[PDB]
């Protein structure tokens, strides 16, 4: 009765790193990314990553439960933390 988000690193560059966030159990979930420092996102497929502040809200658009996001280093190289929220 609980969902989760598995994030893996696919390609890694010297100015940013791609990420692969996914969730199982169901597609109606709420992915929440929490970058650290000032990292930012400039790409997102299979999910819409919008929001403001040090957190980012993510929701499904009727495509699947596996989406990827592109984060920029900016002095950071640790992927963000995603959390599935669906009561």
Radius of gyration of the CA atoms of the chain, in A: 12
Report the C-alpha gap between 58 and 53 in whole angstroms. 14
**In this structure, what are the phi and psi dihedrals at residue 38, rounded to the nearest 5 degrees?**
-135, 20
Which method resolved this structure?
A: NMR
Using DSSP bridges, classify how beta strands 31-33 and 56-59 pair: parallel, antiparallel or unpaired. Answer: antiparallel
Whichever domain contains 11, its CATH number is: 2.60.40.290
| Dihedral over Cα of 30, 31, 37, 42: its sign | negative
Range of the domain at 79: 1-87
For the chain, the domain total comes to 1
């Amino acid at each position: 009765t609980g969902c989760s988000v598995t994030a893996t690193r696919a390609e890694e560059w010297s100015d940013r790193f791609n990420v692969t966030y996914s969730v199982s159990g169901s597609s109606a979930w709420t992915v929440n990314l929490a970058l650290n420092g000032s990292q930012t996102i400039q790409a997102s497929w299979n999910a819409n990553v919008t929001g403001s502040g040090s957190t980012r809200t993510v929701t499904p658009n009727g495509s699947g439960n596996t989406f990827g996001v592109t984060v920029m280093k900016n002095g950071s190289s640790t992927t963000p933390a995603a959390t599935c929220a669906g009561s």
